[model samples]
Target: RRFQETLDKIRKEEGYDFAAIAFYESNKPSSPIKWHYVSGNKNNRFKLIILRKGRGLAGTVMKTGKRMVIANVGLALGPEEKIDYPILLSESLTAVLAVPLWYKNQVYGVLLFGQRDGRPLPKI
Candidate 1:
């Protein structure tokens, strides 16, 4: 219901935007997403962009069960731990936003989005 409402209302809204949803599982390297629905770069580098459970935007959301927004990727993440998140480097995302998907009080997945140019998220 909520997702429909948001997507519906926002459908009438205008701007350049894209969204990517990643799921969590012990089998996968990181949370996962689809190729089309969102505004991903649709580039080659991101072809294998996977994330870890405790790292990156999707992983953090997976572990914490909380929504997050990082205004600047460089400052929020440093060189040392940056190795843990390959999708960040692969996607070259600067500004990012994410929300958690929970079931039975446990975070089962993450819905993540970002812009390579570091634009702030929408107010709505």
Candidate 2:
């Protein structure tokens, strides 16, 4: 019934290697998109990571309110100096797809699906 539970079910049902959801609450000031729900994670690398608005994959979708599909996430990014791709490297994710959650014409959340291979996720 909860978001985390739902994510787990979907990850298994959809054959996803990783599934996560991020959100920014309006009531909170300067709240970045935090990974609130995750499935298939091997460790605690992303627990404290914050996707600042317009920053990484999740943040970009949140700011632009647009969906995204990325292949070879590691090869696509460069100069990882600002702790930008921590999770991508920590989890070794190679591909990703993201979508924004909008309400009242404002983005409040992000849903991310990732894989650790050169190929992208399946389309259906």
Candidate 3:
């Protein structure tokens, strides 16, 4: 609940079209790696982007446990890799920033934000 409120505040404040948090579940017996929380999603379609250790955007972050910022998605992710994901393409996201969330020195999740139009995020 607190995180949801924080995401809402950040979305409004930052003027971003989308904000999400994808976490790796330790308790789950199946599908341990997955994206969970999301705000401003157009169709709740991103729930399907079940990331492995090192695959896609969230996967890369999960594997490296590092922050990533893409000023432009079209130039960054390839067409084949980019079009398959419905939420990303449907939302028309052009710029993105992904940060790893850690708990107990282990990467728990990734927090991401993106914009529809091609615009760089303000420095924080």
Candidate 4:
């Protein structure tokens, strides 16, 4: 609920297109850690991104437990890697930020924010 509230607030305050929370679930079969909760996604296509400890976006966040900000997705991702992640490509997102959510010295989840226009996240 708190995360939902925060996401809603960010959506209203910053006018972002989408926001989501990806947490490390221990019970998942493919990947223990995955991206789950989401808001403002029109198609609802981004499901659990079962990431390993040091792979994709969520994986990087889970491994480092640090905040990541990408000013431009096109510049960050290569042409070959672009089509591999269908949800991200379909969303038309240009800028993104991934923040680690910690609980008692452990990384539990990640908070992701995205925009299509490559706008910087508003200071809040």
Candidate number of the best TM-score: 3
lDDT against the true structure, each candidate: 0.59, 0.75, 0.75, 0.72
Summarize candidate 1's per-residue lDDT along 1-124 as a digit string, tens digits.
6664554344335242445556643455543532222343445665465555566566677778889877777788886765665556666777667788778988766665665676665663
Query: Over 4 Å off in model 3, which ranges?
Result: 25-32, 83-87
Consecutive 10-residue window with the lowest summed lDDT within model 1: 31-40
Model 4, global lDDT: 0.72
Worst 10 residues of 2 by lDDT: 78-87
Q: Give the lDDT of residue 10 in candidate 1.
A: 44
Clashing pairs in 3: none
- lDDT tens string, model 3, 70-96? 787888788778854334665678888
Clashes of each: 2, 0, 0, 0
Estimate, for each residue in 1-124, the C-alpha lDDT of model 4 and write its tens digit.
8777887797767777878787766665555566577777766556634566666667778789888787777888886795544446656778787888888999888787788777765663
TM-score of every model versus the real structure? 0.62, 0.82, 0.83, 0.80
Over 3-121, each residue of candidate 2 has an lDDT whose tens digit, in order, gives: 88988887788767888888863457787767777889878878778777788777888778889886666557764642675557656777877888778988878887878766567
State the RMSD for candidate 3: 2.3
10 residues in a row with least lDDT, candidate 4: 82-91
Instruction: State the TM-score for model 1.
Output: 0.62
